[model samples]
Target: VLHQPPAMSSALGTTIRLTCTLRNDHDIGVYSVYWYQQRPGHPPRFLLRYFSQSDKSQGPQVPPRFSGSKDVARNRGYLSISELQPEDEAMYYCAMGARSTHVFGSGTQLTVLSAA
Candidate 1:
């Protein structure tokens, strides 16, 4: 199992990418990938999930502004937020499978750049 902690900040009204990197040394053929959000005083909420190759899944509670994708070649997954807002700033995480608890990357702190 591999973990990439979230790092960096993002500006409002822009796209931010959160990446989680892991190695399947165990050769786990079937693995599920997912993402979540953590607020200051609230529990983590599921954002999205991907099963099988090129298959993407999302939670109904997720905002329309959020999306995710995966690259089989690189074995990397990414989460993107569009038209970011201050309220959007929070710790984002990614998980591999339900059986193997979700693994999180260092979260990226998004700071909305003020409009001049």
Candidate 2:
């Protein structure tokens, strides 16, 4: 089974870190973290990620501000986006490559309160 991440609704105005607030975070360290995106109306685009633990992705880009984190010790993890444009406001999806598995979920969304 793949890690069927839920669809989250959020926004980026005055860019900041927004966490996915994953329900289950235990053993998440082993489970490779994968995050995608959804503008307003368009297909989901996979965000910049790594190949494996300790293996950094060698490419052009200064690390993503919209990164995620988890506390295996507490078994709770979530997505945290940083440095998002104020114009960046909408829904966001999360996903991860299971190597050879299909990840599916109930399909959820994350929304945030944008605007100053």
Candidate 3:
């Protein structure tokens, strides 16, 4: 089965990456995945969603920098952040639940890759 860590909290102005995996050889067509960002005191905002081999849906307020893609060879889904600002940092989560309970992976803390 796909293994992941517990949920975590992070600081502002940093970058974060949430990862998910498909455990078995099941057809991915049975699932739809989505990512979300929740700020300290604000409501959760939809970032992007993916379905099947090549279907992707994004929210209206989402920036062009936000994207989703599948890596079939590795059985993983990847989300990336570039040119991170303080506002770009927040708690990120990934889910594949429709009306049921959604699952999220342990979060990664991304400090600013400072210049030397």
Candidate 4:
């Protein structure tokens, strides 16, 4: 199982950083991380996939501001969105995969608040 904050909030035009922490038994370098966004009653939408600092891929239609990275020492993967907007509000989950098996984070509910 993975660990993530149950909820977070960010004001418009700011940046929000979400983190997924892998369990002690899991090796961060041996797995690939996937970031997804889910809205009410809809399946998750792929955002980006990151394996290492240099090896990564973003979904075909993902937002330009979305990015991902990992930290081996901390056994964590990070998903960050810049210039956050109302449309960014949703549940974000990070999944880690090794070969055919995958484990997903508990998910983080992101709420966007007015900047003014």
Candidate 5:
């Protein structure tokens, strides 16, 4: 079964991570898997391309706290944050493409509680 987090909540300065996994019979992360982030009233941003163009690494221009990884053996892709912040709040989505079609996970909504 495809894997994804429905929601993640934590206070500021805490550690959090998100992941997406493909089924046993599906394509793996070594070829095509990506992560994106969408904020309110803004177009989605390409946060990570962990396994595209044969590159198993995070994408360009992403925030410092963000990282990406590919686990082809387990057919998975992951996104991580070292320390949560208000600006880190967003809807994180995972996607994979194969044979001209795309499959996307339901996505994870991350809420970083602000300090007051």
Candidate 6:
């Protein structure tokens, strides 16, 4: 099972860290973790994937501010957004491909408060 916080709030210029935890029996490092972003009415957009520190891919349009990491011991995957902006507000979901199926987290709704 994958678990993510229901909501998170951050300032427009600050950085935010999101975590997706894998429960039950599994090592998170063994699988590639995928991160997606969805706005109010828009479909989910692929952000990036994390298999390890050196092994990861981000979409061409995805900025460098979007990065991810995974930990095997804790079975947790992380997504960090730096230099947050108003346009960055959205719901973020994490997923993992296992066997023939893919497991998804409930998703975290991120709100960027005005800074200033």
Model 4 quality (TM-score): 0.92
Q: List the residue pairs that clash in candidate 3.
A: 13-86
- Sort by TM-score, best first: 6, 4, 5, 1, 3, 2
Q: List, residue by residue over 2-81, the lDDT tens digit for candidate 5.
A: 57879988889987878788876867744566788899899878876666445754667887677776677878777878
TM-score of every candidate: 0.77, 0.56, 0.68, 0.92, 0.78, 0.93
* The candidate that achieves the highest TM-score relative to the unseen native structure: 6
Superposed by TM-score, candidate 4 places the C-alpha of residue 76 at a distance from the truth, in angstroms, of: 0.8
Scanning candidate 5 in windows of ten residues, the lowest lDDT window is 50-59
Residue-level lDDT of model 6, residues 1-116, one tens digit each, is 99999999999889899999999597786889999999988999999989988899997799999999776788889999999999999999999995698778999999999963
Q: After superposition, how far is residue 8 of candidate 3 from its true place, in Å?
A: 11
RMSD of 5: 3.1
**Ranking under lDDT, best-scoring first?**
6, 4, 5, 1, 3, 2
Candidate 1: regions farther than 4 A off: 24-30, 52-54, 100-109
Model 3 worst lDDT run, 10 consecutive residues: 107-116
Model 5 local distance difference test score: 0.77
User: Which residue pairs show backbone clashes in model 6?
Assistant: none
Question: On TM-score, who's better, 1 or 6?
Answer: 6
Q: Per-residue alpha-carbon lDDT of model 2 for 1-116, expressed as tens digits?
A: 22334444445444443333334633445665555555667866555443243643422443466555655664433455665555345455444447696343333455555643
lDDT of 4 by residue, 1-116 (tens): 79999999989999888999988787887878899999999999999998976899899988879999878899988999999989999999999875577678999999999963
lDDT values, one for every candidate: 0.67, 0.48, 0.62, 0.89, 0.77, 0.91
Better model by lDDT: candidate 1 vs candidate 4: 4
Q: Weakest 10 consecutive residues, lDDT, candidate 2?
A: 50-59
Residue-level lDDT for 86 in candidate 2: 50
